[PDB]
């Protein structure tokens, strides 16, 4: 995701990334929004389903 | 310097259309803090979100406001949050040219920078001869020894002249020596039924003329006094009279509460209370300035300084309101409660 | 909920811009109606164009704000109109969260909300002494029995005190028990000439000194009394002694007309006649709020809701001007001849 | 036509955002300044730039603003400059259709025509009672020849009634044939203390009654009164008794200083001095006007042009302040020496 998210075919957007080196902490978007919420926490599954 | 105080009105009247998380903004507004929030957490090293949802990421927004506010004002409030430290860097933010600000905002500003480097003629609020050591009795006969008139002060806005029969005389005196007026609108009438200085009623006929700089005016009406001309007074009459001359209003380059528009609710909205941990904060905050930190000044401030640090409180305020801050705040212990206008009134010392 | 309003607000604004057929738009209106217009016409199923030119256009538009108007209100205004009807749907279309509102509006609803929801000290309008349902003359001497300093009302904001040779006292006892001030602003001065219990004039001589909470005051000069400290007169002079106190202002928490920026000129926007159309519009519209049909309140109002109200009608009235709407409504007969301020002052019961 | 005015004031706040020259513009301003610039340039062949530098091209945006700013005042100032020449196809500007004008723009001018046209109710500034040519002494017992009841004034807002033992009788006559009231709101209060025809203190007992149109009213308390019910007063007491009745405000369809929105504050920014350029600037233009050219109005105005015109102004002179401008003028010598509250003084004749 994280790579593919950052592979930019198109003209590219502004990517803020986190102090954590972890994938998906940057906040790509005019308008930011947080990658970080598609990680993956078992205890919560923030990123996938459900 | 203008361009900064405009910059710093438009980010934080810009964080308070953040009424909810998902509602869609006028991209305006998102173009705007783009690049404001960019160049902001590049200087001071903060994590401002253009979304906030959490809290810390709303006070994080909050405290930049306030960076800003501060800034824009020219203010340095030192140690009074734990949780807060001030970011002199802020200025730099507000300088960068690639921030715009509103058209709103500018002619805000041009408003206070304009009034505020210059005078202008502005009905004064309160009476004319409200400076007055003494004053006397309304409708009480008073002749001074040797005077055949005898002006004398009677109220905040009044005085009454004792003629005798056949006396006159210049009264323009007792006026002049205080203030500055340019022009004093007066209104005089005939106190048809006075006292005399034994108790007795005396009647004051028909007759009795004023008239200013020489023109003759009627009773009853509006007159425009430039102060400097001749206050004449005359009693052609047989008999003792008394007539009233009121000083409706007067215009002076004094300062009033109608300098800026509805400047009178910017500074209620400051001085409202909301809750402790703002009471606190706006106190904290005048108490950097020639404001009282929580009563409304008596006199109108006149300084450039003055009035654009009550606008940016003002919003600051409202910003306030809208993000529902919460943070901690030297001597000040929040009651967690609803509050109450009990609560309130206490708040203040 | 407030976004809601804000919206309406910003709709309603946004068609006050169509003032001519051919005219371009601002690109923010043509960005909110273009939206606003599409959803509305998708639950109400009415006829909205972006640009009326024939008059059942115009009206359809004006029946539009009129919805959003009341729901941004909680107002259902009943039957009122044969050509008009109210759906209650159009709240649905203002909560969606689609619909854009502008920056002006949002800080508008913020500020409303804001002191609103809290308290703050102001300016009261009227005299202190407003309430009370005995006076005294104005200069006269008058001693209570058996009482040395006798304090005693004498006009709206004015009292006197008769102090005998010699005497002294407290006197706060006469402000107290009345209102809830928070500061009452002082300004003292020596009845020079005054009469007696029988008529005779009578002069107080220098010396008579009033002391706040122990501090010695001048005469002439405001002063910040807290309405708790101990106000004492004391008259070491070897006659009869009498000295006016005004109370040229109160601060206090109740609400004024200047808790929201030129309150007053909307509620004059909102109560003025235009013609009967409006005028019974209006009336109908606040005989379901608790504010006065067709009267200003006597009492500025405290609560969001009646502020709201005012401002959304205010703005309402404005898009009322504009559009040129004609339509019926139940007990409204309109007199075509040229309206004039006669017929306009019989509209008002 | 309002159209027009509202793109003049559009034209002139969208200049007001140049306080400086690299800063970026609010996209939307660069769309408003690109045609309207583009369209002035080529109906008047001035060389006006979007983004001013030097001082002539500074100059130059000024006297467009001007020229619009007459153009939709409907002005005419003549020849009174050297350096200006006011073209007046600049309405033909300001006609042109693909110009576009702010929402804030349409809803002020909408405002102005839209009160400026209808009446309705205002508070009213000062006393009932200020237009009288007679006044009598308050607190002071008058019995008119063969009357047991004798009304009669005794300041701006007070009258005090005269009552012989077991008297009664209609009040109401002495208010009437004044002005045109919609509403007089009322307070009486009892004169416990006051003078009689002789010097003697009389006391008025507790007893008397005030009745407004049947129903009987409390003392110190407001009443509505329409002007046209029966003031009944009633003294069931076996002695003389004197009561106060005030008018604490009256409502009437005259005009006030609150018809638009901070109409006081914009007024103030243009009878503002500045400099002497602006000063003579503004005062040729009032000349042209039924408004006073220096002064602020004793009444404020009534007529849309009037209106139109102020806030014209004082946009104007916001614009003057950003661009600071600098012209010859007919009759008019600059005073460079830093300017004091003394030289502004001095200019207003």
């Known amino acids: ?50 | 310097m203008d361009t900064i105080a405009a910059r710093a009105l438009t980010v934080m009247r810009a964080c308070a259309t953040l009424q909810e998380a998902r509602i869609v903004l006028e991209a305006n507004v998102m173009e705007i803090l783009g690049i404001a929030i960019n160049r902001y957490n590049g200087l001071t090293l903060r994590g401002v979100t253009m979304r906030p949802t959490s809290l810390a990421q709303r006070n994080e927004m909050f405290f930049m406001c306030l960076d800003m506010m501060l800034s824009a004002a020219g203010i340095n409030v030192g140690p009074i949050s734990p949780d807060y430290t001030q970011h002199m860097a802020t200025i730099g933010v507000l300088a960068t040219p690639e921030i715009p600000f509103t058209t709103e905002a500018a002619n805000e500003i041009a408003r206070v920078t304009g009034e505020t480097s210059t005078w202008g003629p502005a009905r004064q609020p309160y009476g004319f001869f409200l400076e007055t050591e003494e004053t006397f009795q309304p409708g009480r006969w008073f002749m001074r020894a040797a005077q055949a008139a005898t002006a004398v002060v009677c109220g905040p806005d009044m005085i009454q002249v004792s003629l005798n029969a056949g006396a006159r005389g210049d009264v323009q005196q007792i006026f002049q020596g205080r203030n500055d007026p340019m022009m004093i609108y007066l209104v005089w009438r005939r106190i048809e039924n006075f006292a005399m200085a034994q108790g007795n009623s005396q009647q004051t006929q028909a007759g009795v003329t004023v008239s200013v700089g020489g023109v003759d005016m009627r009773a009853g009406r509006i007159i425009a006094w430039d102060g400097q001309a001749a206050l004449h007074v005359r009693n052609p009459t047989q008999q003792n009279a008394m007539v009233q001359i009121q000083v409706v209003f007067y215009i002076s380059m004094d300062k009033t509460l109608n300098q800026y528009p509805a400047l009178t609710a910017e500074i209620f909205n400051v001085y409202s209370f909301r809750d402790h941990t703002w009471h606190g904060l706006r106190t904290a905050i005048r108490n950097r300035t020639t404001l009282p930190n929580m009563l409304p000044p008596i006199f109108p401030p006149n300084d450039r300084d003055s009035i654009l640090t009550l606008l940016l409180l003002s919003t600051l305020a409202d910003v306030y309101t809208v993000l529902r801050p919460e943070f901690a705040m030297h001597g000040v212990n929040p009651m967690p409660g609803p509050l109450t206008a009990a609560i309130a009134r206490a708040a203040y010392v």
């Open chain 1, 1 to 50: 995701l994280n790579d593919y998210l950052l592979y930019m075919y198109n003209t590219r957007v502004q990517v803020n990334y986190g102090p954590t080196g972890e994938p998906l902490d940057f906040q790509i978007g005019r308008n930011q929004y947080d990658c970080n919420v598609f990680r993956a926490d078992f205890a919560t599954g923030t990123g996938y389903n459900g």
